[PDB]
Amino acid sequence: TTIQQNKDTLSQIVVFPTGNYDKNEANAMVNRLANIDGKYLNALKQNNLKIKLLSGKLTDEKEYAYLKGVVPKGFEGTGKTWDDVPGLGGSTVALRIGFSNKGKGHDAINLELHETAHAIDHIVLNDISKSAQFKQIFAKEGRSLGNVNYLGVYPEEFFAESFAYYYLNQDTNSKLKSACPQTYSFLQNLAK
Ligand SMILES: [Zn+2]
DSSP states (O other): OHHHHHHHHHHHHEEOOSSOOOHHHHHHHHHHHTTSOHHHHHHHHHTTOOEEEESSOGGGSGGGGGGTTOOOTTOTTSSOOGGGOOEEESSSEEEETTOOBTTSSSOOSBHHHHHHHHHIIIIITSSGGGSHHHHHHHHHHTTTTSOTTTTTTOHHHHHHHHHHHHHHOHHHHHHHHHHOHHHHHHHHHHHO
């Protein structure tokens, strides 16, 4: 079945953390990633993207020390830095176990799907969220999921959040279709 094939793909790219952690929650994160269309997961594997699950802060990892003490875009005036952010996506994917849900230090409906979407956008699709077509859709629909000063201002964040809505569950998929029909259609066409 497609679920088992996606888990097979994920078994080759997911890096579980050193040390001890909530193993059931880490498994739950993998099971949510397995709902992403296999085409995208296998394209990430082709590009040697590692999905790193972490048991500590993002900036405890050597490869993210360049973010120590830096304020992410949109976090200005909050006193928070990347040290306090539970997930990152783009050229890499890093995810703190236990912080999946909205409000756990981040605004996404689901951390792992949002961050992995960034990697798909950047690594696989050459920053499609900043392509002319998506910029047009973002200009009309980019505020319709709320968070208008973040999703509505950064097309790469609107893309990642829409992707997460599309793939998390049937409730979020239907909410995206109602709120952002052109974005939904774009994602339908992207998967074909
Ligand atoms: Zn993001």
